[PDB]
Amino acid sequence: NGLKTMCECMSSYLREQGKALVSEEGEGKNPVDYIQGLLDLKSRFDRFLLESFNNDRLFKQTIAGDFEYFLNLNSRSPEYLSLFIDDKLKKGVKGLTEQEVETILDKAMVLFRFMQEKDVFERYYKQHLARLLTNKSVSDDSEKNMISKLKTECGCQFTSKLEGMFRDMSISNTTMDEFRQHLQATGVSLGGVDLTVRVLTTGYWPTQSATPKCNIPPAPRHAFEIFRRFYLAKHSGRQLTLQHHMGSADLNATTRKHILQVSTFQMTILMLFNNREKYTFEEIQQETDIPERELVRALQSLACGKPTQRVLTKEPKSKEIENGHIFTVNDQFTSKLHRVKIQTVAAKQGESKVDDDRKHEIEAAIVRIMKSRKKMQHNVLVAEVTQQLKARFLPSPVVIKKRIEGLIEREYLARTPEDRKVYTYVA
Amino acid sequence: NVDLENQYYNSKALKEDDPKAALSSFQKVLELEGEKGEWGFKALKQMIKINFKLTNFPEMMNRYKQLLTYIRSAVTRNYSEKSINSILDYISTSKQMDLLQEFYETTLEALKDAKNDRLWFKTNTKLGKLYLEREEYGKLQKILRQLHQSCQLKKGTQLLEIYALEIQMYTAQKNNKKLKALYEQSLHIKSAIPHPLIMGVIRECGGKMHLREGEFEKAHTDFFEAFKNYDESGSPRRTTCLKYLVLANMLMKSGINPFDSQEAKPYKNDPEILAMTNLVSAYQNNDITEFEKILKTNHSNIMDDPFIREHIEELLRNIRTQVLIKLIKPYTRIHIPFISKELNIDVADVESLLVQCIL
Amino acid sequence: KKRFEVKKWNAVALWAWDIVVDNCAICRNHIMDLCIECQANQECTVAWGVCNHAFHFHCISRWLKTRQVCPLDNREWEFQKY
Amino acid sequence: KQYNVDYKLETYLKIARLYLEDDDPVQAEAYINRASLLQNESTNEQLQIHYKVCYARVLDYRRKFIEAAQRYNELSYKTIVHESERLEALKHALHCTILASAGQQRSRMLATLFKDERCQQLAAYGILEKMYLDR
Ligand SMILES: [Zn+2]
Ligand SMILES: [Zn+2]
Ligand SMILES: [Zn+2]
């Protein structure tokens, strides 16, 4: 009878808080602490909704409408949510209890529920899990639980391809166990080197590029050759195009023997350095098929800001090294640690016309959606729209699906889901 | 931590023997260790595995028990699970049954008083698989009952795992009715993240139940899903699933060559699948003589299974009916013996087929 | 005693089918044919699904006229990759 | 490593004609199918003409005659193709149309071949003339 004033005052407070916390301008603060503050304010509002109003339905729906009103202002929020999820799941030492983790995941899931456009959300999942490929450093079963609870309310395709991610990892480790058992049963001398092949799939995992063809040293080349021979057996019908962008390896170097950590390209560079000293940059580039664009990250990572370990340095000490900087091999024992690693390069290498094509795609989709009007029930329209075009991969049925999904906002194509029979027929 | 890694690697660098000198170094590492660091865990793993090569079982059990009490909260659960699996694989390759179950029940109790929902379940299911390997039934009833009580939805994976275990149990002793009940119960679940091997068994059981019951439509879908899941995982249960899929596609009035599907094209020249390849080349593009020759040339493979045998009488019948329908289209009045000649069967059976088709 | 010795290597592979497709299983002709109906009377393209099952457009269209499942896997068919 | 479209196409055509030299239809058909997959991005029209020639040849060699005759008739009208092998293709088309299975397609292609004035100069014209009127 007199609660209208309180409702209006709390709605105005929510409005001012939301316009303060959108902060489309004045950026510069740490994104992770910003997202932590977003979590804190959301949890504070949830606590206020639960403890005082006793989860009343009226207050629940009013706060939901409020959140929908002040939540659409920001755009690059799903990246922030994926970043927060990855950060929380990476370090499970603080809060190993599954209850707090699952309540955080429930908050994230309900927040994602009020939002749409999960395609960018899942491509950001792909980006974070690509750069899972390294050491696990996760909980695994928690990821399984959250993906199952997501699939319960999401459905198929994307959930099925994430299930494919997990199934691929598991079958890869079981195939590795099988290969180790085969090596133990039939002894091979070249199998003395440890092999941790982790084959992937191409239809579900993200693709980077065609990858270079960096040369393999003799012994690893023969080890991968025998692995290829084994894998062509058993189940056939597939090949293995070995990549070089990602990989973790170790090497014994010099004097106490120190164990160094290298990532693919550095291994081949050192192997080339071995057989003969006094090697210059052009000589290395001539017979290693070293990349061009991503070479920049590794070239400025092997020097120019190394830690106190100082494993390798070049005599042409300069910020830029164009063509003829001669490299030299040096002892440089320095640190007494026996597990010096260059993993820190991963902590700094991550930093730093489609117009006509997208115009043509949008125009084609729009003319297809208005022009066709042919008799369809649920799928033959998808057939005829791609029939009309002369060249393929231009249709891309996903755009037709999203167009017909967003086309239900008013009278046209607003037919009954329960019986999807009448669809304006031929009109 | 600086000297920690250096000392651990100095103790590791022996790599030719273990005269308690590396063990004393690991003990010193533990003495200088802080609060449950992964370096200490890997040092304990290394010394335990290197002293497996030097027998001394009682110290194995003692320090394995202390390691299990250590793993309660010291490192991410993936690392501990991987270490447990690796140590179980290492100790299983040398048999050593008695210490094997000693380790098994010590792990059971250690995970009972430690975290239970996510770690004890996986170890218990691994024990269930190992105990199925020994087919020592009766007590497995108690094991499955205690597992069912522990799990009991938002637990789809656990329920699917226990359903697969009990389905294997009930198909071990020909419990078709209970198998159907379990298949229905698993069908009630509509959300899970199965292992690539777990779902295959239940799909095979469901396909077998559908084939035996009489419906020959969902059987192909179930068998195809089972074969698709078996392609990635395992290998022993690959040829039989393909054979059963071929039989299912045989019984459902043909329709699309099963081997033309790209997921099974390479499995054509296998001798165990060449019979099915010839059978599908004969059934498609209707040919009585080729079908009869293929059936007769391979009695050993075909007429020996308890499932193909029961469905060759339903077969060898659709093909003749199709031949009769194709031949009867242009004519309007013919002789029965003329049909008998091409159909390769007596006149009485020709009349029986004709009366059945007319009715 | 080589200067450097490789001890571990975490290789990453990418498995793909040796034959992507060679037949439309409604007309027994390869995907670059006209799907027999267009061969007799003379445009014609291929179609794909989530199950990665390539067929002739006209064949899958005349299949979907009365049916709603993929001919091979016998599950719900929907268009993907034209 | 990928070399170029032209090299792969020419090697495929060479192996296809080598197969046809020793009447191996299945391997030639598989290689012409992969050429079918890879030909939609080709830029050289001479390679396309040779591809059409070998496609018609493999289709004729696969005991399928109506479509082979249609392909030969279509190829016989190429402007860049010289008149001599145009006449050769027309003769092959007539030989393929005559040796086929009776049907509506056979009669249609028969009438189409009869309409062309160049086929009058062809040697085996009396058989065509008798075939047209259904003797
Ligand atoms: Zn087709
Ligand atoms: Zn067509
Ligand atoms: Zn399909």
Curated annotation (Swiss-Prot), chain A:
Its main location: nucleus. Pathway: Protein modification; protein ubiquitination. GO terms for biological process: anaphase-promoting complex-dependent catabolic process; cell migration; cell projection organization; cellular response to amino acid stimulus; cellular response to oxidative stress; COPII vesicle coating; embryonic cleavage; endoplasmic reticulum to Golgi vesicle-mediated transport. Core component of multiple cullin-RING-based BCR (BTB-CUL3-RBX1) E3 ubiquitin-protein ligase complexes which mediate the ubiquitination and subsequent proteasomal degradation of target proteins. BCR complexes and ARIH1 collaborate in tandem to mediate ubiquitination of target proteins. As a scaffold protein may contribute to catalysis through positioning of the substrate and the ubiquitin-conjugating enzyme. High-glucose conditions in renal tubular epithelial cells lead to up-regulation of CUL3 expression, significant increase in CUL3-mediated ubiquitination of MRPL12 and dysregulation of mitochondrial biosynthesis. This is Cullin-3. The chain holds residues 308 to 768 of 768 of the full protein.
UniProtKB/Swiss-Prot annotation, chain B:
GO terms for biological process: inner cell mass cell proliferation; negative regulation of transcription by RNA polymerase II; neuron differentiation; protein deneddylation; protein neddylation; protein phosphorylation; regulation of protein neddylation; signal transduction. Component of the CSN complex, composed of COPS1/GPS1, COPS2, COPS3, COPS4, COPS5, COPS6, COPS7 (COPS7A or COPS7B), COPS8 and COPS9 isoform 1. In the complex, it probably interacts directly with COPS1, COPS4, COPS5, COPS6 and COPS7 (COPS7A or COPS7B). Specifically interacts with the ligand binding domain of the thyroid receptor (TR). Does not require the presence of thyroid hormone for its interaction. Interacts with CUL1 and CUL2. Interacts with IRF8/ICSBP1 and with nuclear receptors NR2F1 and NR0B1. Interacts with NIF3L1. It is found in: Cytoplasm; Nucleus. Residues 219-359 form the PCI domain. Residues 1-240 are annotated as: Mediates interaction with NIF3L1. GO terms for molecular function: transcription corepressor activity. Phosphorylated by CK2 and PKD kinases. GO terms for cellular component: COP9 signalosome; cytoplasm; cytosol; nucleoplasm; nucleus. This is COP9 signalosome complex subunit 2. Its main location: cytoplasm. Keywords: Cytoplasm, Nucleus, Phosphoprotein, Signalosome. Belongs to the CSN2 family.
UniProtKB/Swiss-Prot annotation, chain C:
The keyword DNA damage applies. It is an enzyme of class 2 (transferase). Zn(2+) 1 binds at residues 24, 27, 56, 59. The keyword Metal-binding applies. GO terms for biological process: cellular response to amino acid stimulus; cellular response to chemical stress; cellular response to oxidative stress; cellular response to UV; DNA damage response; MAPK cascade; negative regulation of canonical Wnt signaling pathway; negative regulation of insulin receptor signaling pathway. Zn(2+) 3 binds at residues 51, 53, 70, 73. Keywords: Acetylation, Cytoplasm, DNA damage, DNA repair, Host-virus interaction, Metal-binding, Nucleus, Phosphoprotein, Transferase, Ubl conjugation pathway, Zinc, Zinc-finger. Pathway: Protein modification; protein ubiquitination; Protein modification; protein neddylation. One of its GO terms (cellular component) is Cul4-RING E3 ubiquitin ligase complex. Disulfide bonds: none annotated. Widely expressed. It catalyses: S-ubiquitinyl-[E2 ubiquitin-conjugating enzyme]-L-cysteine + [acceptor protein]-L-lysine = [E2 ubiquitin-conjugating enzyme]-L-cysteine + N(6)-ubiquitinyl-[acceptor protein]-L-lysine; S-[NEDD8-protein]-yl-[E2 NEDD8-conjugating enzyme]-L-cysteine + [cullin]-L-lysine = [E2 NEDD8-conjugating enzyme]-L-cysteine + N(6)-[NEDD8-protein]-yl-[cullin]-L-lysine. A zinc finger (RING-type) spans 35-74. Its EC number is 2.3.2.27, 2.3.2.32. The RING-type zinc finger domain is essential for ubiquitin ligase activity. It coordinates an additional third zinc ion. Belongs to the RING-box family. This is E3 ubiquitin-protein ligase RBX1. The gene is RBX1.
Curated annotation (Swiss-Prot), chain D:
It comes from the Eukaryota. It is found in: Cytoplasm; Nucleus; Cytoplasmic vesicle, Secretory vesicle, Synaptic vesicle. Disulfide bonds: none annotated. Component of the CSN complex, composed of COPS1/GPS1, COPS2, COPS3, COPS4, COPS5, COPS6, COPS7 (COPS7A or COPS7B), COPS8 and COPS9 isoform 1. In the complex, it probably interacts directly with COPS1, COPS2, COPS3, COPS5, COPS6, COPS7 (COPS7A or COPS7B) and COPS8. Interacts with TOR1A; the interaction is direct and associates TOR1A and SNAPIN with the CSN complex. Interacts with STON2; controls STON2 neddylation levels. Interacts with ERCC6. Component of the COP9 signalosome complex (CSN), a complex involved in various cellular and developmental processes. The CSN complex is an essential regulator of the ubiquitin (Ubl) conjugation pathway by mediating the deneddylation of the cullin subunits of SCF-type E3 ligase complexes, leading to decrease the Ubl ligase activity of SCF-type complexes such as SCF, CSA or DDB2. Also involved in the deneddylation of non-cullin subunits such as STON2. Belongs to the CSN4 family. This is COP9 signalosome complex subunit 4. It comes from Homo sapiens. The lineage of its organism: Eukaryota, Metazoa, Chordata, Craniata, Vertebrata.
